[PDB]
């Protein structure tokens, strides 16, 4: 009946913590260089009886992944050739795409050369014909090295020793809330850092029903994340058979111009099976109605955020999603979507610099699982009359939340003090 | 055997019988091939793990328990910390809600432990004829 | 500058009355008019602020509203204790420079 | 629970200077300011002046030159000086505490100022862009600033007032 | 935590009746849920218990063939509490089955008296009559 | 107290993709050079205590 405190080391106690995580890969400059190869077999230990609160929107793993992708992007772009001198005045004629001849410094400082390259309409603007690249008055530009690949490969985010990652294994788990079935892991599953807007590509699929996750459903300002239970298939091709012309512009420097087109005058596109997309859209509106219906396109000016922007084989595609979002619901024939291509992109020109995606020789074709979506409501009208949904891809972090929704970081507090009827041996 | 943190939801005694699994799997060692942002990260994380481990070992030693795991003290359990009897604590609560209930008074208990151990050692110094 | 108010108003027990407060964009138009009741004898009592927000203890039958450069104080269920001089007021370009109205006197007829 | 106590002279001769004091006891402020308003018999209220917690002073533009307001934090009082007293200045002078706050133009929560959108696409009422669009401009994310008055002012507490008569 | 039982039902002899027991304020999955009755003629009588976690049931021999005990899956509230629901359906009612029925939360998660009814609900009155 | 009384103006002239030089525009105001005042009384007291130490 006399109680004394006793120290316990290694008690199952953890607290919510934000720490600097590290990467893991095994099979591409961004992740093949990565860090330490993953363990041959990961240990996922189920924790019986344990119910833990998750919050995907206040998660720090998302911000960590975001800054890590940004820093990796800069580290891989730094050593490559910067096309500062390619801002010469351009004389352009019609072949959209334009044949532009311009002077260029040769290897010898005194000599100059007149070369020609093919440029997409989005890359060039006229001034007073004479033209310039659109970026030259906003920012400098650097050309992505041809060897490095923009293909996302799975990167596992790991917690250090003394910390742990908690993984919710609840199939119907909402974005935030108490998870009745929790297991612990040292590293997450293989997450491909697919850069995308609007529809999500190559993600992980929710089991049982498709999942709708927001920070606040009734708030229009907060986006809507959609995760499929069944993946839809989307085939994207750039049919133009482009050619790469390496023109030397100095000692070592070499610009990769677009040669004359070989083949058809067709623009890149993506097909999606109409049957599967109709089933998926039906299940989507069913889970939408679980909290409440038409779908319309978003029209906001910036082409790279209004269109399903992504990267495929090294070319950056921007896709008209109007075929997917023209609908109204009150409960193969594959649809085809047009995609334009940009080689100059500025996702952070102000933070840093712009990137020139080098042209890809030949026809391009990639097959992608479309696992998710990112939506947004309109401004609140007369209540409960009608609800309209337009697709957005406003930020890249929502993709990280889309794959980090199940994970959470905690630090182990192995020090527990508890009362027993025990006293140390008297001196 | 359930694995690391396997008894997190178990009764405090059921988890207490297998604290050693959690305590052992607390320190890793994940080699390298960094020979970069990733390297800075891996190096920084390396330090923090053994740093927390050594802070905990420091606390264990300054309480007379450098041998780790299970040890007893001369500090009586002041009823103001928690009013529950032995059966309730060891067979009704898990370690998580326990540390939640006692987090208000943890540091006071730590101070009582360090001071009781220091007085024991002063007695040891007195303890020769 | 002085906000324009009628010299006086009056009404009988169990009725509604309204007081107008005409200013300009730089004061009433700013959309933060306040209303104050001065009963001859007692100290002034703040009644309405921020166009519509009621002060503590002010019953509901005292309502403040505003359209453009004209603010309105509506008083329903007139009681004998309402007889008083009423002043509107508003900031004028400055959140420290305040302007008042000329005042309107309320008399209540038909008392026991 | 704010308490205000006025003190000063009851009688001025013509053209004398009137110095009054207001002692605040039991402060319970939240920014705010302390000041003076007046009312001549049979006339409307006329705002005179105030001083705020940051030390800035302000006076009724039509009377500033005859007015002067100081403060003393150690005595927890403020003063009022009125030069050239005439029969026009015989009046009830109320010490007041007032809520003062300037609201700058602010975007609604979850929105951030993004002038690029209207600059380059010409949209109206789109000064703020949804944060969900990560610095990109979306017409579906447009929004004006928080609808509210630019300037907030009202009297939050009134002193009992002090009557000043000017007479030979 | 609070245990809220269904209100009251009137049933004719030979019929069946289903009493509910909704829980909150504690982890429903952890503590056993017992069903005990009280009649004026025979006094207090323990009927059985069921585990919300495993589904294991233990019925007294007198009610093994006419009483059905079920539980739902716990609905999490925070982490240390949840809401749940258990049901007991008693059939072939007789006049001596008239009385008050209770569901009750157990005492300890482990030990020598895990199922021991510790936290009781307000009771459900069952009347068998014509 | 140190003041540069000239009311200078900054002219951002673009000299390449991204690069921008900040030139000095025409002066607005007086043709006075920057200066600093120091109270002679306080500086005489301080100088006295200095020469004492
Ligand atoms: C997660 O949380 C849950 C819930 O809190 C928790 O489950 C509790 O665990 C504790 C201990 O871990 C349990 O407490 C122990 O219970 C033991 C099991 O009780 C026995 O009796 C049942 C009744 O048997 C009668 O009826 C059957 C027919 O149904 C008949 O054949 C029998 O002869 C008898 O008449 C029996 O049904 C039950 O069977 C279940 O479990 C067995 C495995 O044991 C399994 O084979 C079955 O299929 C069925 O699922 C079981 O046989 C009990 O033995 C024990 O008492 C001894 O041990 C303690 C020390 O623990 C000694 O002090 C004591 O003196 C005894 O020697 C103790 O009472 C508790 O009942 C669980 N349930 C709760 C609280 O609701 C999990 O453990 C948690 N897990 C983690 C990882 O955290
Ligand atoms: C998730 O998203 C929804 C989107 O609808 C948000 O719900 C709305 O939230 C806003 C505030 O964030 C509400 O607007 C405010 O209402 C206040 C009164 O709230 C009570 O009354 C309402 C109506 O009866 C109840 O529904 C509510 O539950 C409360 O009981 C007003 O006082 C507010 O006005 C004041 O603030 C605004 C600035 O916010 C000023 O401009 C005003 O002048 C004034 O000072 C304001 O109007 C709105 O009513 C909510 N919608 C509904 C349908 O109720 C959720 O808040 C959001 N979740 C979270 C956690 O943010
Ligand atoms: C995305 O959507 C686009 C269209 O929107 C698809 O493009 C089509 O792709 C198919 C390939 O599966 C192309 O099909 C080719 O058709 C040729 C002509 O067939 C037509 O004529 C016959 C008789 O008149 C009709 O019965 C028939 O239906 C067609 O109308 C064939 O000759 C081709 O066969 C080839 O293979 C055989 C065997 O190897 C050879 O012997 C032939 O000589 C020939 O080389 C072929 O089947 C079709 O032309 C494409 N359309 C367009 C407009 O380009 C994409 O396939 C789809 N998916 C993506 C992009 O992933
Ligand atoms: C979602 O996830 C899927 C699955 O990973 C991705 O699909 C991958 O797309 C990439 C393109 O970005 C594919 O990589 C390219 O494949 C081309 C076709 O490969 C055929 O030929 C090779 C010859 O060795 C065969 O082994 C293979 O089986 C195929 O039959 C190749 O021509 C490409 O090679 C070029 O690039 C590589 C890498 O830079 C260089 O090393 C080469 O020298 C060459 O220049 C390249 O391999 C990849 O195969 C696809 N994977 C799968 C499983 O289909 C999607 O791209 C992804 N979504 C997004 C948006 O990224
Ligand atoms: C460092 O030292 C320099 C000089 O070496 C100082 O510069 C002076 O700064 C003062 C400000 O404190 C300037 O004073 C201005 O004087 C104007 C003219 O007054 C003259 O004329 C009257 C009558 O003839 C004389 O009695 C008086 O002594 C002066 O000779 C005033 O008109 C100015 O007043 C302003 O404010 C009032 C009220 O707000 C307005 O109504 C007025 O219209 C006017 O705008 C002002 O007081 C003085 O001119 C400066 N001298 C020079 C040479 O520039 C620095 O102040 C000092 N400290 C630093 C730099 O920190
Ligand atoms: C995107 O591209 C995908 C390919 O990368 C497309 O998937 C392919 O779709 C075609 C149909 O358009 C499938 O072809 C079918 O094949 C089955 C099975 O063939 C086998 O069996 C037959 C005997 O029945 C045998 O003769 C063959 O040799 C095979 O052993 C046929 O039964 C069908 O009739 C049909 O021809 C492809 O199989 C399928 N690819 C894969 C890998 O399964 C996808 O449809 C494209 N999506 C869009 C939206 O364009
Ligand atoms: C220097 O870099 C700037 C980057 O901030 C460039 O600014 C952007 O340049 C693009 C094209 O180069 C512009 O896009 C065009 O915008 C117009 C606007 O249309 C409206 O205005 C016209 C005339 O004012 C009117 O007639 C129409 O009816 C519209 O009401 C579009 O019509 C075009 O189709 C095209 O989209 C951006 O607007 C512009 N943004 C800003 C903020 O200036 C700038 O162009 C670069 N300098 C040079 C010389 O190119
Ligand atoms: C460098 O700049 C400094 C300012 O940043 C200078 O310090 C200032 O010097 C002037 C004098 O030149 C001081 O003015 C004095 O103020 C007092 C007190 O004013 C208060 O009391 C009066 C009633 O007497 C009241 O009416 C006011 O509203 C105030 O409440 C007067 O009594 C003096 O006569 C004189 O006007 C400034 O106060 C002082 N600044 C501060 C912050 O104290 C400094 O002198 C400069 N140094 C050099 C070398 O140039
Ligand atoms: C983009 O414009 C350039 C020049 O403006 C085009 O290059 C020109 O291509 C033509 C063929 O279509 C060349 O003509 C041939 O040149 C050879 C050179 O030995 C000559 O022997 C033949 O008799 C014939 O004239 C031409 O030389 C070449 N360069 C110029 C300056 O005209 C280029 O084809 C255009 N790209 C596209 C896609 O249209
Ligand atoms: C999503 O759908 C909207 C419609 O709700 C699309 O906007 C519309 O796009 C069509 C293109 O087929 C425009 O038609 C063309 O407009 C031009 C304007 O110069 C006109 O010259 C042509 O003759 C033709 O009529 C239509 O005007 C336009 N309307 C609006 C209100 O934008 C939008 O492009 C789609 N966006 C995505 C991302 O799917
Ligand atoms: C430094 O030197 C430059 C040039 O040497 C000066 O710029 C010149 O400033 C004068 C005004 O003083 C300008 O004259 C006016 O120009 C406008 C342009 O439209 C014209 O319409 C007027 O009729 C008038 O002539 C002149 O154009 C301008 N540039 C040149 C080349 O002379 C500058 O003012 C000097 N800075 C200083 C501080 O003196
Ligand atoms: C995600 O699901 C959780 C439940 O797991 C929701 O939490 C409930 O939120 C409502 C507010 O509308 C509260 O009244 C309930 O008490 C909450 N339940 C629990 C168990 O906490 C949460 O709102 C959902 N999130 C979204 C964005 O829909
Ligand atoms: C126990 O705790 C109480 C309250 O914190 C304190 O007053 C007392 O001194 C402590 N020690 C005892 C009772 O021995």
Residue numbers in the entry:
A (entry chain G): 32 to 58, 67 to 134, 153 to 185, 189 to 309, 312 to 321, 321A, 322 to 353, 359 to 397, ...
B (entry chain B): 519 to 553, 569 to 662
C (entry chain R): 2 to 9, 11 to 27, 27A, 27B, 28 to 95, 95A, 95B, 96 to 106, ...
D (entry chain S): 1 to 82, 82A, 82B, 82C, 83 to 165
E (entry chain F): 2 to 52, 52A, 53 to 72, 72A, 72B, 72C, 72D, 72E, ...
F (entry chain G): 295 to 309, 312 to 321, 321A, 322 to 348
Task: Give verbatim lines from the article.
Here, by x-ray crystallography, cryo–electron microscopy, and site-directed mutagenesis, we structurally and functionally elucidate the mode of binding of a potent bnAb (NC-Cow1) elicited in cows by immunization with the HIV envelope (Env) trimer BG505 SOSIP. The exceptionally long (60 residues) third complementarity-determining region of the heavy chain (CDR H3) of NC-Cow1 forms a mini domain (knob) on an extended stalk that navigates through the dense glycan shield on Env to target a small footprint on the gp120 CD4 receptor binding site with no contact of the other CDRs to the rest of the Env trimer. The HIV-1 envelope (Env) protein is a heavily glycosylated trimer consisting of heterodimeric gp120 and gp41. The most broadly neutralizing bnAb isolated from these sera, NC-Cow1, had 72% neutralization breadth on a 117-virus panel, with a half-maximal inhibitory concentration (IC50) of 0.028 μg/ml.
The NC-Cow1 structure was then determined to 4.1 Å resolution in a quaternary complex with BG505 SOSIP.664, in which human Fabs PGT128 and 35022 were added to facilitate formation of diffraction-quality crystals. The preformed complex was partially deglycosylated and purified by size exclusion chromatography (SEC) before crystallization. The crystal and cryo-EM structures of NC-Cow1 with BG505 SOSIP.664 reveal very similar binding interactions with the distal surface of the knob domain contacting the gp120 CD4bs. In the crystal structure, strong density is observed for the glycan at gp120 Asn276, but only a few contacts from the stalk HisD42 and ArgD43 are made with this glycan (only ~19 Å2 of Asn276 glycan molecular surface is buried by the Fab). The glycan at gp120 Asn197 is visualized in both the cryo-EM and crystal structures, albeit with a slightly different conformation, and contacts knob GlnD15 and TyrD16 with 115 Å2 of buried glycan molecular surface in the crystal structure and 150 Å2 in the cryo-EM structure. Other minor differences between the crystal and cryo-EM structures occur in loops around gp120 residues 364 to 371, 426 to 432, and 459 to 467; however, these differences are likely related to the low resolution of the structure. The antibody-antigen interaction buries ~834 and 768 Å2 of molecular surface on gp120 and Fab, respectively. NC-Cow1 Fab makes two interactions that mimic CD4 receptor binding. TyrD31 inserts into the gp120 CD4 Phe43 binding pocket, and ArgD11 makes a salt bridge with gp120 Asp368 that emulates the CD4 Arg59 to gp120 Asp368 interaction. ArgD11 makes the important salt bridge with gp120 Asp368, while ArgD27 makes polar interactions with Asn280 and Asn283.
